[PDB]
Structures are given as structure tokens and as C-alpha cells.
Swiss-Prot record, chain B:
Catalytic activity: kanamycin B + 2-oxoglutarate + O2 = 2'-dehydrokanamycin A + succinate + NH4(+) + CO2
Enzyme's top EC category: oxidoreductase
Entry keywords, A to Z: Antibiotic biosynthesis, Iron, Oxidoreductase
Pathway note: Antibiotic biosynthesis; kanamycin biosynthesis
Organism: Streptomyces kanamyceticus
Name of the protein described by the UniProt record: Kanamycin B dioxygenase
Primary role: Mediates the conversion of kanamycin B into 2'-dehydrokanamycin A during the transformation of kanamycin B to kanamycin A.
Pfam families in the record: PhyH
Entry EC number(s): 1.14.11.37
PANTHER family, per the entry: PHYTANOYL-COA DIOXYGENASE FAMILY PROTEIN (AFU_ORTHOLOGUE AFUA_2G03330)
Length: 281, 282
């Protein structure tokens, strides 16, 4: 439990920073390689995070009204996709030049975003088990990254309101009998790892982007504030990793499909139902 | 290269078409051969009734393939990419869903491994020499990692040293030094000569009815067919569930037995016929 993002994991940026100088990029990649998690503070304008926060809080009633509310492991951790309306699809969020500079260097120039989702942590939420979002590709084998989660807090994350617990360096661990069918870490391996490299939790100011190995051990924790804690979630994969495409309206096709910052996208005529995924074509 | 009179014993498991399963010792030997050498020859797997129909169908299609404006060719003249027909009458469970093949690919790639290729290589008389290449790259440069794909090659005639039996580089499937491969999967000549000194390539006859299973990363090349008859090969490739591939187009008249199976196929089922006569030509 820290007062701020630890300097060992953190690069302090401004929203005007378009690309890292070679020394900054080398430090960014050294942090991801060693720790599996990188915090970039001050990247997104409050204008963008304000609109995304508002849109997801406005959508929450429609999510909670569903017959079965999609939940991550335990009560209060709701899966919620942000809107894919043209007015809420921002190049600086989907196609951030600093994020893609980092993901291109780790995953290659053909790396592609294939997730546009979110994690709404409700007041009174329960403790998640420690897990990874994406598995190792073979059991018992050491291999490099094939995916980088890109997490965008939409309010100030604090120790009180459910700032994620991260397990530094856990992204390289893949012993036999380590993971169950839900990507939860088997308790024996949790405790062995805790003795060598215990987890961390820290406040993350809104405007930050967290880039982490998709294999990093982490868990959502109780939100003990009065307000829901929204996170917007993206994940960059190597070109060769099979993912369903992100459904986007064809009104963003002009700037999404042009880019050398690739998205695995399917462009739809008219509006996408971002909550039910249940539009006709 | 080393020119042999038969498939070498070190790379070969002799079966009959009645063999539905390898006993544990045979399976262990099969996996040890794939791990060490990256290529396994299984003789006597397919009935002549099946290979006769597939051979006939591909030779009958060849005129229509060669009549096209732009003939899909692998690297050099005479190595033609040709899909076998996906008519229901020529789609055989013992070819698409072979129990011995999937026993081996399940053990190497997992129970979720899937066939995502149903294609072919027609080697024409007077064909040229291909450069040495791999069909599927390593997933990261400079890194050692296990297999993610197994090519399943079905000769549709007897392959001989004369009619273009493939050159294979045994043990080459684990080699991934920096700056080894170009954008077409060709091996840098400097790495070819370093490797040749330690483990030279081999060419050998393979009788029709055989199935060749090899690491998709194995170094190989098509060679000149010096006979007067085209040399047809039917080609399939099993991949880990997580490797992105376009689906095989199949008619919905095989959906009942293909889509049921615990021998997975990455398939898109179409109403009516597929026009099989190219995305896999390099
Ligand atoms: N950080 C972004 C998001 O990450 C997780 O979603 C992930 C899944 O974890 C992953 O699934 C993997 O894990 C499961 C168990 O290992 C397997 O069934 C599955 N076959 C395997 O590919 C999908 N491929 C992609 C999806 N975006 C969280 N739930 C989600 O709330 C969060 O926003
Ligand atoms: N043994 C079966 C077949 O294998 C090869 O075809 C392969 C391609 O090689 C492969 O492509 C890979 O290698 C390319 C060339 O470098 C890269 O561009 C590409 N990114 C990379 O995925 C495709 N994915 C699948 C296709 N079946 C031969 N060509 C073909 O004649 C033969 O019948
Ligand atoms: Ni998670
Ligand atoms: Ni080839």
C-alpha cells in the first residue's frame, strides 16, 4: 500500500507528449520486461476522461437492468463496454501514439488492439482471486509477451476505491499446475511467489495509462467509496493471436482503418449495441 | 543433400489402414521423432481407393488451373498451388479427420488443435528448384519455443527422387537465430551452409498411402520433377487454437460429421458448392 505510483514502474508524461525519446522508450521497455507493468501519468486530457466517465456512469443502469449482470469472479466487479458512438471514440484513446510506440517495440509493427471494454467496480464490491487476463501459450514454458493490456482509469484510483493489486514480475511465471480453467493462480504458487516478490497497490491519477503484460498476476479489490470506479480496458496482441474483432460504426472507418496503429475491427452500418453485442450484421 | 532409397527408419513408423490408434510405445516414438527431427513418415495409412479418387480429381482439375491468367506458383516455375475439390463425394473422414494424425497432433498441440488448411502442391514436369524455406515462421525472432503447427502432407502418387520428393532438413525446426529468415520464409544462405555441415538435408521416396507429419517451421524445398507426370500433394496443417488462420470453406453437406467431431477443423460451412479453383501461394 503506497501513496503514489512507485518511481520504479512510472514515467511522468504530459498530454502533449506524442513520442518518447530513445532513453525514455528504453526505460519504459526495461520496466515492462522486468516488472510486467508500466504506469504513464498525465497522458490523457481531462476533456476525454470526463466524457468517457460520464458515458459509462450514464450506461450503468442499463447494465444493472440485465437479467444476468456480467461479473468478474465476485460481486461488484461488473463487465461494461464503453460506447462505440463516433462522438466518444477518440484517436488519443484508441490510437495513442505513446501506447503504440511501446506496443510496436514489444509486439511488432503489426500488433493490433482487439479489446474495447471496461471494468466497473461498484461500492461494496468483494475481493477477486489473483488471476491473469491472458494465459501463457504452452504449459510449463517460458516465452516472450504476445499481449499488452492498456488500462485507462476514468477517475482517480485510490487505495479506498479499488486501485488494482499488481504482482510485479509475475508475467514470466509459468510452472506446471499454476493456473486453473479461469486463469486463477493456484494458492500454493501464490504463496511461493509472495515470499520472493509481494504484490503492490497504489493510487493512479485520472489521465494515466497503465500498460502491462496480459499474463501479469493481479486482482480487483473492494471499492469502499460512495462512487463506482470505472476503468476503460484495451489489449494489444501480436498479429497471429486469434481474437474476435471489435465492432465499430463505419463513421470512424476513415481514421481507424487508415492508421499504422492497427485495430482488429469490423465496421458496421449505423449504430453498434456495445452492451449486448446483439445488433443484426 | 543425402539421396536415400526409402524413408529412413529413424523418421518412419510403418502402419496399416486398420490402425485407428498408436499403442503408448508407438505414440512415444512418434512424438520423440517430431521433437528431435521435426518430420515423421507414417507408411500404409490410407487405402488406395481414397488416394486413387483424390489423384484423379486433382489431375482432372489441372487443365482448368493452368488455363487461368495468373497461375499461383510457389517461388519458382512448376510448383503450382492447387486446392483439392471440397465436393462431398471427395471429402473423406480418413483424410480430413484421420484418428492417428489427430492422436499425434492432440499430444503435441493440445486437444483444441485444429486443421485450418485443405490445399495442395502440384509439382509439374520441368519444375525449377525452390529456395529452402519454412511454411510457417517462428513467432518471435531469436527465441526457442515449442511447435504451434504440424503440416500433414499426403502424397497422391509414389514420390521418387525423379518426380520431386521434397528435400527436408531434419532438426531444422528448432533453429531461430537473428537475421535467419526473409519476408517469404526463405533461410539465409549463410545459415543454410552452417546447418549443412552439422545435419545435411535428405530426399527419399515416399509411397502413396503414406502421411508425412512435420513441424510447420521445418526447413524444406520443392525440387525439379524430371518425370513426364505431375506430382500431386494434398496438404493440411493443424494449429494451436490461438493461431489466427482464415477458415477452410466446406459445403454444409459435410457439416454433420465435420462440426460434431473432437478432431477440430477451422471451417466455414457454405450452402452449395465452393469454387476451389491463392492466399497460401508464396
Ligand atoms: N484486461 C482486459 C480484460 O481482460 C479480461 O478479459 C479477457 C479474457 O480474460 C481473455 O480470456 C482468456 O482467459 C480465460 C481464462 O484464462 C480463457 O477462457 C480464454 N479462452 C482466454 O483467452 C480473452 N481472450 C480476452 C478478454 N478481453 C477480463 N475478464 C476483462 O474483465 C478485462 O476488461
Ligand atoms: N504446407 C502447406 C502449405 O504451406 C505454405 O503455405 C502456408 C503459408 O506459407 C503461411 O504463411 C506464412 O508464411 C508466409 C510466407 O512468408 C507469411 O507471409 C505469412 N505471414 C505466414 O503466416 C500461411 N499462413 C498458411 C499457408 N498454408 C506453402 N506456401 C504452401 O504451398 C503449402 O501447401
Ligand atoms: Ni483481471
Ligand atoms: Ni514449402
Amino acid at each position: 500500500a503506497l501513496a503514489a505510483p512507485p518511481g520504479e514502474l512510472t514515467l511522468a508524461l504530459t498530454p502533449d507528449d506524442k513520442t518518447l525519446d530513445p532513453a525514455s522508450l528504453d526505460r519504459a521497455l526495461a520496466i515492462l520486461a522486468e516488472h510486467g507493468i508500466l504506469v504513464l501519468t498525465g497522458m490523457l486530457r481531462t476533456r476525454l476522461t470526463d466524457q468517457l466517465r460520464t458515458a459509462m456512469l450514464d450506461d450503468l443502469p442499463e447494465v444493472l437492468r440485465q437479467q444476468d449482470v456480467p461479473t468478474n469472479f465476485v460481486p461488484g466487479h461488473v463487465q461494461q463496454d464503453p460506447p462505440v458512438r463516433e462522438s466518444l471514440l477518440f484517436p488519443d484513446v484508441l490510437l495513442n501514439p505513446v501506447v503504440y510506440q511501446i506496443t510496436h517495440a514489444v509486439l511488432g509493427a503489426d500488433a493490433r488492439n482487439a479489446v474495447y471494454s471496461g471494468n466497473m467496480n461498484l461500492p461494496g464490491s468483494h475481493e477477486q482471486p489473483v488471476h491473469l487476463d491472458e494465459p501463457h501459450l504452452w504449459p510449463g514454458i517460458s516465452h516472450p509477451p504476445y499481449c499488452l493490456c492498456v488500462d485507462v482509469p476514468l477517475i482517480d484510483f485510490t487505495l479506498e476505491n479499488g486501485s488494482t493489486e499488481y504482482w510485479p514480475g509475475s508475467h514470466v511465471l509459468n510452472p506446471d499446475e499454476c493456473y486453473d480453467e479461469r486463469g486463477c493462480v493456484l494458492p500454493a504458487e501464490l504463496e511461493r511467489r509472495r515470499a520472493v516478490a509481494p504484490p503492490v497497490r497504489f493510487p493512479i491519477p485520472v489521465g494515466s495509462v497503465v500498460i502491462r503484460d496480459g499474463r501479469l498476476w493481479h486482482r480487483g479489490v473492494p471499492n469502499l467509496s460512495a462512487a463506482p470506479r470505472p476503468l476503460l480496458a484495451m489489449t494489444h496482441y501480436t498479429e497471429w493471436f486469434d481474437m474476435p474483432p471489435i465492432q465499430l460504426p463505419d463513421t470512424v472507418k476513415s481514421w481507424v482503418d487508415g492508421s499504422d496503429r492497427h485495430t482488429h475491427a469490423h465496421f458496421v452500418a449505423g449504430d453498434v449495441d456495445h452492451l449486448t453485442g446483439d445488433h443484426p450484421f
